[PDB]
Amino acid sequence: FDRDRLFNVVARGNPEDLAGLLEYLRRTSKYLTDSEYTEGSTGKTCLMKAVLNLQDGVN
């Protein structure tokens, strides 16, 4: 599980595709605010791109 897959998941908007993320984070013992999940060069997180991409009024 990687950063690009997570950004594609939050950009698409399927809640079923975000499966086993908590189990993966508990297995590797790292959080969503870690440097591998954020961009780091600009600090962009998955919540920021998740709010940027709104096909409807909600995501």
Side-chain angles (χ1 to χ4, degrees), residues 22 24-25 28 31-32:
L22 176 57
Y24 179 74
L25 292 172
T28 191
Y31 294 104
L32 290 174

Side-chain angles (χ1 to χ4, degrees), residues 9 25 44 46 51 58:
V9 165
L25 292 172
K44 184 176 180 180
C46 63
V51 177
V58 304

